[PDB]
Amino acid sequence: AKTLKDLQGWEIITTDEQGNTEHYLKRSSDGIKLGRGDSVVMHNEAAGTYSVYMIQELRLNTLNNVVELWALTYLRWFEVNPLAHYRQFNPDANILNRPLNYYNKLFSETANKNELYLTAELAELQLFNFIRVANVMDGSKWEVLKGNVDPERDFTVRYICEPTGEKFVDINIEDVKAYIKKVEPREAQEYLKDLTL
Amino acid sequence: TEEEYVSPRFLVADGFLIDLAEEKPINPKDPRLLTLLKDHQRAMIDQMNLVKWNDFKKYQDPIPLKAKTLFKFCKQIKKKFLRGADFKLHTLPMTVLCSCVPILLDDQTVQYLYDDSLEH
């Protein structure tokens, strides 16, 4: 009950320096390149809005050109637990007098809607849902970028957390990207998941 | 009409359910909401007054709205309309480049909402 579809427009590239084991997909038309550590804006039918990921691994087949694109899932502002955030970042968090809608509003109207949150949850991606390359950066770089931010592709990450939007832990996204494209998939994914346990 | 955050993503203001993740209005009948929202949230929307997007099919010209909140959070685009003598904006075929919000109906015809607190 399976069929083989051709990944139109894409082409696999094998290297170390170049050559005909390291891998990364390249798109013929514009030539964009996707490999471990790159972040991408993807179409998410169920959610009715985009989701951003960081390519974790490119599982390829030695026999045929079958590719599987796997990646770490980011959370966008609206997937953060509003009460958890307030309790962990607000100065006088002991007082939670107000109705849930109030915290929803507070967070939504003061959050950087382009600040993502890393998570260790992997998801397989389908190329036809690929929208554009995402620029995920550190707060320092994000500061220099203000006034020239392209909300369609520019994002900043300072924490990693649980898929539920709790337990925020500091990270240097650049160090994470560097790390991810260094070690082996399972290793990186295991470590990334133990930072919030 | 009253405003309120049904969730961090969904905001109800000026008669529309606003999807902040997409920066646009969403039909309160979109099946996705059945899964995207919890019952208490969908109940909040029931108890509120929401424009029935089907009532829109019947109109050919863009609709002028008095809704400071909607235009504050929704993406807008430039569209060209005719400036009639009734001081309203009309479909093209006295031209004005006006920014407005597009909403996709079931009729598949796109309806345009522009800020009525603006003089062109």
From Swiss-Prot, chain A:
Keywords: ATP-binding, DNA replication, DNA-binding, Magnesium, Metal-binding, Nucleotide-binding, Nucleus, Phosphoprotein. GO terms for molecular function: ATP binding; ATP hydrolysis activity; chromatin binding; DNA replication origin binding; metal ion binding; nucleosome binding. GO terms for biological process: DNA replication initiation; maintenance of rDNA; mitotic DNA replication checkpoint signaling; nucleosome organization; pre-replicative complex assembly involved in nuclear cell cycle DNA replication; silent mating-type cassette heterochromatin formation. One of its GO terms (cellular component) is nuclear origin of replication recognition complex. Its main location: nucleus. The chain holds residues 2 to 213 of 914 of the full protein. This is Origin recognition complex subunit 1. Component of the origin recognition complex (ORC) composed of at least ORC1, ORC2, ORC3, ORC4, ORC5 and ORC6. Interacts with MCM10 and TAH11. The N-terminus is dedicated to mating-type repression. It comes from Saccharomyces cerevisiae (strain ATCC 204508 / S288c) (Baker's yeast). Belongs to the ORC1 family. It comes from the Eukaryota. The lineage of its organism: Eukaryota, Fungi, Dikarya, Ascomycota, Saccharomycotina.
UniProtKB/Swiss-Prot annotation, chain B:
It is found in: Nucleus; Chromosome, Centromere. It comes from the Eukaryota. Changing F10S: Abolishes interaction with ORC1 and SIR4. Changing D19N: Abolishes interaction with ORC1. Residues 1-116 are annotated as: ORC interacting region (OIR). Interacts (via OIR domain) with ORC1 (via BAH domain). Interacts with SIR4. Interacts with CAC1. Involved in the establishment, but not the maintenance, of heterochromatic silencing at the cryptic mating-type loci HMR and HML. Is recruited by interacting with the ORC1 subunit of the origin recognition complex (ORC), which binds to HML-I or HMR-E silencers, DNA elements that direct the formation of silent chromatin at the mating-type loci. Establishes transcriptional silencing by recruiting the three other SIR proteins, SIR2, SIR3, and SIR4, that function directly in silenced chromatin and establish repression. Also found in centromeric chromatin. This is Regulatory protein SIR1. It comes from Saccharomyces cerevisiae (strain ATCC 204508 / S288c) (Baker's yeast). The chain holds residues 461 to 590 of 654 of the full protein.
